[PDB]
Design a protein around this ligand. Structure first.
Ligand SMILES: COc1ccc(-n2nc(C(N)=O)c3c2C(=O)N(c2ccc(N4CCCCC4=O)cc2)CC3)cc1
Length: 126
């Protein structure tokens, strides 16, 4: 169903949030090897989430669930804002620009919060 597909995508998103927190702690602790590994993990999780979201979006659209589609489109906008920030943060990491990296972390926390509430709203609209 839309609900079961939603729960699959939710578990991928929940992993992405948890991995981000572990990555951030590694950065603060100076473990750059770990930061690099977790950035690569996040890149793959974001790709997977995008793939899952698009399939759910089209099913909800065919089902005439206009509210869920509207909320999914809002979530995509926040998620893609975060993805673009993430890509710039990966560049800052490999360039050793730690002040840029810190600024991006702050921006990603704000985007993540917007996506967390939208994710809750999507579940209610199903
Ligand atoms: C079909 O559409 C969705 C959308 C979202 C969910 N979904 N459900 C839950 C939940 N029910 O717990 C969660 C999510 C999710 O995706 N979450 C998330 C992942 C990633 C970001 N980030 C990280 C940094 C880059 C930007 C960005 O947006 C933000 C939020 C929060 C947890 C299911 C289905």
């Amino acid at each position: 169903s839309v609900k079961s597909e939603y729960a699959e995508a939710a578990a991928v998103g929940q992993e992405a949030v948890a991995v981000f927190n572990t990555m951030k702690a590694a950065f603060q602790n100076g473990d750059k090897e770990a930061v690099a590994q977790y950035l690569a993990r996040l890149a793959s999780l974001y790709t997977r989430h995008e793939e899952l979201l698009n399939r759910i979006l089209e099913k909800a659209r065919r089902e005439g669930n206009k509210e869920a589609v509207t909320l999914m489109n809002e979530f995509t906008a926040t998620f893609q804002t975060g993805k673009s920030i993430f890509n710039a943060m990966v560049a800052a990491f490999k360039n050793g620009d730690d002040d840029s990296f810190e600024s991006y972390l702050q921006a990603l926390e704000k985007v993540t919060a917007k996506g967390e509430t939208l994710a809750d709203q999507i579940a209610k609209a199903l």
